[PDB]
Amino acid sequence: MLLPWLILIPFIGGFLCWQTERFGVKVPRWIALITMGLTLALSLQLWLQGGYSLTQSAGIPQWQSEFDMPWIPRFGISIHLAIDGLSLLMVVLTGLLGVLAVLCSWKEIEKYQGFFHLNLMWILGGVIGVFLAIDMFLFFFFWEMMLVPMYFLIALWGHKASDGKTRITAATKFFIYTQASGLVMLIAILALVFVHYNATGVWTFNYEELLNTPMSSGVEYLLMLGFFIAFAVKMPVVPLHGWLPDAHSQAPTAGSVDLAGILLKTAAYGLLRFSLPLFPNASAEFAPIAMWLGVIGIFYGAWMAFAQTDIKRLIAYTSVSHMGFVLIAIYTGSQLAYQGAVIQMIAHGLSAAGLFILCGQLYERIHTRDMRMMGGLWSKMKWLPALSLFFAVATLGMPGTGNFVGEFMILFGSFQVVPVITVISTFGLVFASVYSLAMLHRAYFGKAKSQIASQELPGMSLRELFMILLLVVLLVLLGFYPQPILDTSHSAIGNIQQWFVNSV
Amino acid sequence: MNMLALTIILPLIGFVLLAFSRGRWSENVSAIVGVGSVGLAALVTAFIGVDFFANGEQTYSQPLWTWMSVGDFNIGFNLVLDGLSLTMLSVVTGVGFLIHMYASWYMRGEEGYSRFFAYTNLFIASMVVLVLADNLLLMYLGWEGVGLCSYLLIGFYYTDPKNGAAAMKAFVVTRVGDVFLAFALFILYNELGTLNFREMVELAPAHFADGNNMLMWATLMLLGGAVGKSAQLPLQTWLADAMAGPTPVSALIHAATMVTAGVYLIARTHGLFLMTPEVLHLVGIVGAVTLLLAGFAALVQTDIKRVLAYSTMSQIGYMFLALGVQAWDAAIFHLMTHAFFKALLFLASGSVILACHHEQNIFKMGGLRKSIPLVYLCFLVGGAALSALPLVTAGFFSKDEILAGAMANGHINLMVAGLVGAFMTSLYTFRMIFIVFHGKEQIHAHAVKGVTHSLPLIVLLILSTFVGALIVPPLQGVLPQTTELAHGSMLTLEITSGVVAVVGILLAAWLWLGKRTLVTSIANSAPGRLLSTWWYNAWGFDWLYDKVFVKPFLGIAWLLKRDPLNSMMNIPAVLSRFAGKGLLLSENGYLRWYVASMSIGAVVVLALLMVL
C-alpha cells in the first residue's frame, strides 16, 4: 500500500523542484529537504508499525506490505513491490543518505539548480525501487534507470564543461561497465523464464514461481554466472571494479555519497535476495570461486589503498576491500554470517558517507586535492580533523563502531563453515590499519609548512557539523547496541539460509 | 557493590570533556578534572575493595546490557570482580593515579595539554575494561582499546616525526598479536560454545571426552596473543621505540598498565591452560629464553630510557616463567611489588632529565649526589628491589617464593635461568647510577624543588619499599591452583639469591671503582663491538622482522603504484577502438571498390549457401 507512494516521492519532488524553478531559485533546496523527510517518515513508519520481529520460519514468501499491479500483461510483468525486513533497513538507510545529499548541496546555487535536484531525487528514487523489487523486470528496469542520471551528474556537474576528463574517461567507464553486465543479467532472466515456460506453460516474470522452477544440472550454472556478473560490476569485485575510483574522484561529493554509500548496497542485496535462492546448486558449486575472489578483493583493495596519493581515490579503494567480507559472507552456509554482513553493510554506508562529506569539505577549505601536498593542519582546523580521526578509526575494526561487529561475525560464521579461507581473510584488519594510518598521518599529522596554502584557513559552519555529529553518534550506537536491527532482519536472513540449506 | 561501571564511566566521561575542550580551558581547571577522574576511580576501587573484604572474598558480578545476541551467539557486558581481577584493578587505579598525579606537574608549561589528559583517561579506561571483563569478547575490546591509546600517546608529540613515526611499529605489532588472539577466540566458540570464563572452566572437560588434538592449536595460538601485547621473543620489537614519547606515558605503558595485559590473560585462563600441560610449560620455555636476551641490552646503549625498557622486558618474561611453573599467586605478588618500583624508577628519571636540560647521555655526567639527593634515593630504592637484595626490599619475597616454586617444579634449567637472571639484574642495577651520578659534573643538572611532585615522591618512596610488601593482595577469592610451598630450603635459596645479588652489586661497584680503562677496552674491543652490533640487532630479530616482510611489502606496493587489473580489463576497449580504427581505414570513398564490395558479398553469400 505505502510502497507505490514510497518509490514515487523522489520522482514527484523532481517534477516540483523543476516546476518551482521558474518561481524561485532558493526553493528547491527547501523543497528537497522536506520531501526526503517524508520519505524517511514512511520508511520509519514501516519500521515501527510493522511487525519487524516476525516469525523466523514463515517460508520464503513473507512481506510486511505488498503491492501488485498489471504493467505489461503479455509476459505477466507487474509492479510487484514488496517490502521485507532487511529491505526496510535498506530503505531507511537511503532516506538518511538522501537527507545528507540534499544537506551537502545546501547553499549551492548555480545557473541551473532545479535540474541538479530533479536528477538528485531521480537517482535516489531509483535505488529505493531496486530495494523494493520482486518482479524481475521491474527489478531490472529500476536497476538500469538509476544508472542513467548519474552520468549527467558526472558530466555536467563533474566540472562545468571546462575539462574533458570528467566525461570521456570517468563517466563513460561508469556507464559502459554497468550496462553491458546489466544486459547480461537480462538475458539471464530470459533464459530462466524460458526454461520455466517449457516446464509449466505460463509467461511469468514473478519471483515466487520462478523460485522453484525445475532446471537440469549444467544449465542453471550459466544463468548463475549471468546474474553474478551484473552483481559483481556494481559492488566492487576483483575482475571488474575499475569504474569506482574514477567515479568517486570526479563526481561532486554529494554524488559520491550516492555512488558509494548506497549504490554498493544493491548488488549484495541482489546476491542475498535474487541470486542465492533461485540457484541453490549452482551457487553451491560456485562457492569456492566466490571465496577466492573475496579474499583477493580484501588484500587487493588495501594494497591499492596504501599505494595511492590522493584522498577520493583513497576512500574509493577502501570500499573494494570492505565488500570482500560481504561476498564471503553471502556465499557461506551460516545464519550468523549473513546477519554480520547486514550490520557491516549498513556501517559501510555510514562510514563512507562521513569521510566523503569531510574530504569534499576539506578540499573546499584549502582548494587542494593532493594528500601529500598538505600536512599538519591540526593546529588550523578546529573540528574537521578530530571528527575525521574517528571516521578513519571507524573504517577499520574498532569496537564501538558498527564495522567491528559487522566484519567480525562474518568471520565467526566463516570459520564455522570453512577454516582455511577464513584464516587468510582475517589479515585484512592489519592492512586496514596501515591504510587508515597512512591517510591520517599524511593529511593531518605534521607541520603546516608542507604547503604554502596551509597558512590561511576558513571556519566551519553549523549545519555541516550538525550532520557530521549525527553520523558519528549514530554509528557509535550501531557499534555498541546492534540488537534492534538484527532482530529485524532475523527472519528474512533465516529463510534464505534455510532454503539454501534445504534445497541442496 | 553496584559501583563497577563507575571505575569505567567516570574516567571515560572525563575524556569526552577533554576531547572537545581542545585547549580552550585554562591550565588549572583542566589539571583538576584530569586528575579527579582517576581519583574518583581509585576511591570507588577502594570502596569495593574494602567491601570485597566485607564480602568474605566472594565474587560480585554485574551485567549491564547484552552486547549482541544471536540464538547461538550470546555476548553480554558482564563484569566479574574476583580476587585476581581486584588485584589487577588495584595496580591500575593506584599506579595510574600516581603516574597521572605527577603528570599534573610534568605537563605544564607546554601545549597539547587538554589533549594529553584526554588520551590518558582513555588509556586508563581501556585497561580497566580488559581486567574486569567476563567474556573474551569484551576483553578483546580491552586489548585493542589500549593499543590505540598507546598509539595516541607514543606518537604524542606530532611535530617531530621520529616519535611520530615510532608509534606505528608498535601499532602494527600489537595488531599482529591481536589477530593471533582472535584466532583462539574463533576456535573456542567452535569447540566449546560459550566464552564466559567460569562456564568455560566447567564446560571444557565435559566437551573433551573424545578429541583433544585441536585444543593445542587453540591454546598455543591463544598464547601467541598474550605474549605479543606485552613483550616476548617472537614479537619483541617496539619497546625500545616506545621510549621516544614523554616520560609519563613511558611509565604508563611500560610499568604496570598496558604491559600487564598479557599477564592477566594467562592468569585468568589458568584452568584453561591446565587443560593442557605442555602449552603451560611452553610459556616458561619462552620465558627462560627471553631473560637471556632482555638483560644486557640495558648496558649497551647510552639512553637511560632504553635502560629502563630492557629491564621491563626482562621482568615481564620473568613473570611468564612464574606462570609457567604453576605459581600463580606468587606471580601476581611479583606484579604487586613490580608496579611500585618500576613506576617510580621511570618517573624519577624524568625529573632528573628535566634537570639535565637536553643531555640524553650516561657518560658525560657525574657527581650528581651533590646536585639533589632526592632522585639519588629514588634510583637507590628501585635498584635494591630489582637486584633481589635482602635489605628491607619489597620484591625479594616474590623472587624467593617463585624460585621455591620453580624448584618444587624441579627443572634445573629453570633454576639456572633464575640464577643467571638474579646475577644479570644485579649487573644493571647500579652500573647506571655509578656511570651517571658519579664522576664530575661538567654540565650542571639544575634541580627543581616543589611540593607538587615531592608529596607523590614520598608516597612512592613509602610504597615501593617493604612497607608496601606487607599489603597482601586478595588472592583467596578465586581459589586458583595452589602455589606449592617448600620449607627448609627456603632459607638456603634466600641466602643464595642474596649472595648472587651481592656479587653482582660488588662487580658493578668494582667496575665503577676501577680506572674504567678496561671498560673502555672492552667497549673498544672488536669482538666486543661485534657482540654489541649483534645485540644492537637483538639476535637480529628487528633485522629479521623488517627484512622478512617489509621490503617485500614496499616492493609489492611499488609494483601496485599503478593498478594492474583495471588496465588488463581495459583491453576490450583497446581492441575495440583499434579494430574500429582499422574498419574506418578500410573505407575508401572510390566508388569502384564499393561495387567490388557488392560483388564480393555476392561471391561469399553464394559460397556460404553452397556449403549448406
Q: Where are the domains of chain B?
A: 1-536, 537-612
Do the Cβ atoms of B318 and B289 come closer than 8 Å?
Answer: no
Please tell me the distance from the alpha carbon of residue B321 to that of residue B288, in angstroms, as a whole number: 6
Please tell me the distance from the alpha carbon of residue A328 to that of residue A313, in angstroms, as a whole number: 24
Do the Cβ atoms of B300 and B182 come closer than 8 Å?
Answer: no
Q: Which amino acid is at A332?
A: T
Do the Cβ atoms of B174 and B144 come closer than 8 Å?
Answer: yes
Residues of A in contact with B68 (CB under 8 A): 405, 409, 482-483, 486
- For A:10-39, CB contacts with B below 8 A are none
Residue B325's φ and ψ, nearest 5 degrees, are -95, 20
Q: How far is B12 from chain A (nearest CA, A)?
A: 13
User: Residue A8 corresponds to which cell in the numbers above?
Assistant: 514515487
Please tell me the distance from the alpha carbon of residue A242 to that of residue A173, in angstroms, as a whole number: 8
H helices within B230-372, ranges in order?
247-251, 262-268, 270-274, 277-294, 297-300, 304-324, 328-356
- For A:90-109, CB contacts with B below 8 A are none
Residue in B450, B429, B442 with CA at minimum distance from that of residue B368: B442
Q: Where are the domains of chain A?
A: 1-504
Number of alpha carbons in the 13 Å side-chain half-sphere of residue B563:
28
Residue in B132, B113, B117 with CA at minimum distance from that of residue B39: B117
Number of alpha carbons in the 13 Å side-chain half-sphere of residue A90:
29
Q: Which residues contact B516 (CB under 8 A, 6 or more apart)?
A: none
Residue in A153, A112, A105 with CA at minimum distance from that of residue A22: A112
* Cβ contact, residue pair A412, B68, below 8 Å: no
Beta-strand ranges (E) seen in B479-588 are: none
* Cβ contact, residue pair B569, A242, below 8 Å: yes
Residue in B172, B92, B188 with CA at minimum distance from that of residue B132: B92
Residue reference for cell 576539506: A362
- For B:7-36, CB contacts with A below 8 A are 19, 22
How big is chain B, counted in residues? 612
Please tell me the distance from the alpha carbon of residue B440 to that of residue B179, in angstroms, as a whole number: 51
Do the Cβ atoms of A448 and A454 come closer than 8 Å?
Answer: yes
Please tell me the distance from the alpha carbon of residue A233 to that of residue A484, in angstroms, as a whole number: 32
Compare CB distances from A405 to B68, B189, B561 and report the shortest one's residue.
Answer: B68
| Angle, CA of A432, A438 and A444, to the nearest 5° | 130
Please tell me the distance from the alpha carbon of residue B271 to that of residue B292, in angstroms, as a whole number: 28
Q: Name the CA radius of gyration of chain A, rounded.
A: 22
B373-387 and B328-356 are packed helices; what angle lies between their axes, rounded to 10 degrees? Answer: 150
B304-324 and B277-294 are packed helices; what angle lies between their axes, rounded to 10 degrees? Answer: 160
Sign of the alpha-carbon dihedral angle for A429, A431, A435, A438:
positive
- For B:64-83, CB contacts with A below 8 A are 65-70, 72-73
Compare CB distances from A412 to B73, B175, B565 and report the shortest one's residue.
Answer: B73
Across B214-249, b (16+ Cβ under 10 Å) vs e yields: ebeebbbbbbbbbbbbbbbbebbbbbbbbbbbbbbb
Residue reference for cell 550454472: A221
Specify the DSSP element, H or E, that contains B563: none
Specify the DSSP element, H or E, that contains A172: helix A170-199
Residue in B316, B327, B212 with CA at minimum distance from that of residue B280: B327
Do the Cβ atoms of A480 and A408 come closer than 8 Å?
Answer: no
User: Residue B321 corresponds to which cell in the numbers above?
Assistant: 616463567
Per DSSP, B75 falls in state E
| Angle, CA of A325, A330 and A331, to the nearest 5° | 100
Please tell me the distance from the alpha carbon of residue B446 to that of residue B372, in angstroms, as a whole number: 9
Please tell me the distance from the alpha carbon of residue B25 to that of residue A424, in angstroms, as a whole number: 48
B304-324 and B396-409 are packed helices; what angle lies between their axes, rounded to 10 degrees? Answer: 40
Give the end-to-end CA distance of chain B in Å, rounded to a whole number. Answer: 95
Q: Which residues contact A484 (CB under 8 A, 6 or more apart)?
A: none
Phi/psi region, residue B346 (left: phi>0; alpha: psi -120 to 50; beta: rest), is alpha
In sequence order, the β-bridge partners of residue A399 are A401
Q: Which amino acid is at B193?
A: G
CA dihedral of A92, A93, A95, A100, whole degrees rounded to 10: 150
* Cβ contact, residue pair A411, B563, below 8 Å: no
* Cβ contact, residue pair B190, A482, below 8 Å: no
Number of alpha carbons in the 13 Å side-chain half-sphere of residue A138:
27
CA dihedral of B521, B522, B525, B528, whole degrees rounded to 10: -170
Residues of A in contact with B560 (CB under 8 A): 303-304, 307
Do the Cβ atoms of A60 and A23 come closer than 8 Å?
Answer: no
Residues of A in contact with B70 (CB under 8 A): 335-336, 339, 409, 486
Specify the DSSP element, H or E, that contains A40: helix A27-49
Q: Which residues contact A271 (CB under 8 A, 6 or more apart)?
A: A228, A231, A327, A330
Q: To probe the interface with B, which of A396, A408, A440 has the most B CB atoms within 10 Å? A: A408
B136-154 and B113-132 are packed helices; what angle lies between their axes, rounded to 10 degrees? Answer: 160
| Angle, CA of B277, B283 and B285, to the nearest 5° | 100
Q: Which residues contact B52 (CB under 8 A, 6 or more apart)?
A: B58, B60, B81, B83, B86, B474, B477
Q: Which whole-number Å values give the CA distances from B106 to A252, B124, B248, B266, B453, in the listed order?
A: 48, 18, 8, 35, 9
User: Residue A127 corresponds to which cell in the numbers above?
Assistant: 535505488
Sign of the alpha-carbon dihedral angle for A342, A346, A351, A353:
positive
Nearest Cα residue in chain A from B175:
A430
In sequence order, the β-bridge partners of residue B60 are B81
Please tell me the distance from the alpha carbon of residue A487 to that of residue A52, in angstroms, as a whole number: 8
Residues of A in contact with B159 (CB under 8 A): 447
Please tell me the distance from the alpha carbon of residue A262 to that of residue A97, in angstroms, as a whole number: 8
Phi/psi region, residue B538 (left: phi>0; alpha: psi -120 to 50; beta: rest), is left
Q: How far is B562 from chain A (nearest CA, A)?
A: 8
Please tell me the distance from the alpha carbon of residue A25 to that of residue A111, in angstroms, as a whole number: 10
* Cβ contact, residue pair B557, A482, below 8 Å: no
Do the Cβ atoms of A294 and A218 come closer than 8 Å?
Answer: no
* Cβ contact, residue pair A415, B186, below 8 Å: yes
β-strands A77-78, A82-83 pairing: unpaired
Phi/psi region, residue B439 (left: phi>0; alpha: psi -120 to 50; beta: rest), is left
- For B:104-123, CB contacts with A below 8 A are none
Q: Which whole-number Å values give the CA distances from A34 to A3, A22, A31, A95, A99, in the listed order?
A: 19, 19, 6, 12, 9
Residue reference for cell 559483481: A232
Residue reference for cell 510493522: A50
Specify the DSSP element, H or E, that contains B70: strand B60-70
User: Residue B421 corresponds to which cell in the numbers above?
Assistant: 637472571
Do the Cβ atoms of A397 and A407 come closer than 8 Å?
Answer: yes
- For A:141-160, CB contacts with B below 8 A are none
* Cβ contact, residue pair A483, B69, below 8 Å: yes
Please tell me the distance from the alpha carbon of residue A437 to that of residue B417, in angstroms, as a whole number: 41
Q: To probe the interface with A, which of B129, B563, B567, B577 has the most A CB atoms within 10 Å? A: B563
User: Residue B160 corresponds to which cell in the numbers above?
Assistant: 617531530
Q: How far is A32 from chain B (nearest CA, A)?
A: 33
User: Residue B601 corresponds to which cell in the numbers above?
Assistant: 558479398
Number of alpha carbons in the 13 Å side-chain half-sphere of residue B548:
6
- For A:257-316, CB contacts with B below 8 A are 300, 303-304, 306-307
Q: How far is A234 from chain B (nearest CA, A)?
A: 15
β-strands A70-72, B73-81 pairing: unpaired
Phi/psi region, residue A362 (left: phi>0; alpha: psi -120 to 50; beta: rest), is alpha
Do the Cβ atoms of A371 and A311 come closer than 8 Å?
Answer: yes
Residue A68's φ and ψ, nearest 5 degrees, are -135, 145
Please tell me the distance from the alpha carbon of residue B516 to that of residue B523, in angstroms, as a whole number: 10
Residue in A42, A253, A33, A24 with CA at minimum distance from that of residue A121: A33
Q: Which whole-number Å values give the CA distances from A443 to A356, A362, A371, A375, A437, in the listed order?
A: 14, 10, 6, 5, 10
Please tell me the distance from the alpha carbon of residue B332 to that of residue B471, in angstroms, as a whole number: 13
Sign of the alpha-carbon dihedral angle for A131, A132, A136, A137:
negative
Nearest Cα residue in chain B from A480:
B67
Residue in B129, B145, B137, B126 with CA at minimum distance from that of residue B4: B129
Do the Cβ atoms of A80 and A142 come closer than 8 Å?
Answer: no
Do the Cβ atoms of A436 and A403 come closer than 8 Å?
Answer: no
Per DSSP, B468 falls in state G
Nearest Cα residue in chain A from B572:
A177
Q: Which amino acid is at B292?
A: L
Do the Cβ atoms of A105 and A36 come closer than 8 Å?
Answer: no
Q: Establish if A242 touches chain B: CB-CB under 8 angstroms.
A: yes
* Cβ contact, residue pair B565, A335, below 8 Å: no
Please tell me the distance from the alpha carbon of residue A351 to that of residue A328, in angstroms, as a whole number: 20
Query: In a 10 Å sphere around its CB, with 0-12 CB exposed, 13-18 middle and 19+ buried, how is residue B421 labelled?
Result: buried
Cα A189 from chain centroid (whole Å): 23
Q: Which whole-number Å values give the CA distances from A346 to A403, A406, B99, B117, in the listed order?
A: 9, 9, 42, 34
Residues of A in contact with B66 (CB under 8 A): 483
Residue in A447, A433, A481 with CA at minimum distance from that of residue B148: A433
Residue reference for cell 538518511: A96
Residue in A87, A97, A1 with CA at minimum distance from that of residue A47: A87
3-state helix, strand, coil in chain B (%, to 5): 70, 5, 25
Q: Which residues contact B586 (CB under 8 A, 6 or more apart)?
A: none
Sign of the alpha-carbon dihedral angle for A169, A171, A176, A177:
positive
User: Residue A217 corresponds to which cell in the numbers above?
Assistant: 544440472
* Cβ contact, residue pair A430, B175, below 8 Å: yes
Please tell me the distance from the alpha carbon of residue A340 to that of residue A272, in angstroms, as a whole number: 13
Per DSSP, B158 falls in state -
CA dihedral of A283, A284, A285, A287, whole degrees rounded to 10: 80
Please tell me the distance from the alpha carbon of residue A230 to that of residue A180, in angstroms, as a whole number: 8
Do the Cβ atoms of B309 and B254 come closer than 8 Å?
Answer: yes
Show me where chain A is broken: residue before each gap, C-N > 2.5 A. Answer: none
Beta-strand ranges (E) seen in A27-185 are: 65-66, 70-72, 77-78, 82-83
* Cβ contact, residue pair B565, A242, below 8 Å: yes
* Cβ contact, residue pair A482, B179, below 8 Å: no
Nearest Cα residue in chain A from B68:
A483
3-state SS string for A388-439: HHHHHHHHCCCECEHHHHHHHHHHHHHHHHCHHHHHHHCCHHHHHHHHHHHH
CA dihedral of B110, B114, B120, B123, whole degrees rounded to 10: -130
* Cβ contact, residue pair B565, A412, below 8 Å: no
Compare CB distances from A242 to B148, B183, B570 and report the shortest one's residue.
Answer: B570
Nearest Cα residue in chain B from A404:
B141
Specify the DSSP element, H or E, that contains B64: strand B60-70
Q: Which residues contact B562 (CB under 8 A, 6 or more apart)?
A: none
Residue B67's φ and ψ, nearest 5 degrees, are -80, -65
Please tell me the distance from the alpha carbon of residue B58 to that of residue B6, in angstroms, as a whole number: 20
Task: State the CB neighbour count (10 A cutoff) for residue A447.
Answer: 15
Helix (H/G/I), strand (E/B), else coil: A379: coil
Residue B75's φ and ψ, nearest 5 degrees, are -120, 130
Do the Cβ atoms of A106 and A29 come closer than 8 Å?
Answer: yes
Please tell me the distance from the alpha carbon of residue A178 to that of residue A183, in angstroms, as a whole number: 9
Helix (H/G/I), strand (E/B), else coil: B168: helix
- For A:429-448, CB contacts with B below 8 A are 429-430, 433-434, 437, 441, 445-447
Please tell me the distance from the alpha carbon of residue B296 to that of residue B420, in angstroms, as a whole number: 12
H helices within A307-374, ranges in order?
312-330, 335-366
Q: What is the resolution of this structure in A?
A: 3.8
Q: Which residues contact B535 (CB under 8 A, 6 or more apart)?
A: B296, B297, B300
Do the Cβ atoms of B91 and B333 come closer than 8 Å?
Answer: no
* Cβ contact, residue pair B566, A242, below 8 Å: yes
User: Residue B398 corresponds to which cell in the numbers above?
Assistant: 616474590
Please tell me the distance from the alpha carbon of residue B32 to that of residue A232, in angstroms, as a whole number: 56
Residue reference for cell 505477466: A76
Q: How far is B8 from chain A (nearest CA, A)?
A: 15
Please tell me the distance from the alpha carbon of residue B485 to that of residue A431, in angstroms, as a whole number: 48
Method used experimentally: cryo-EM
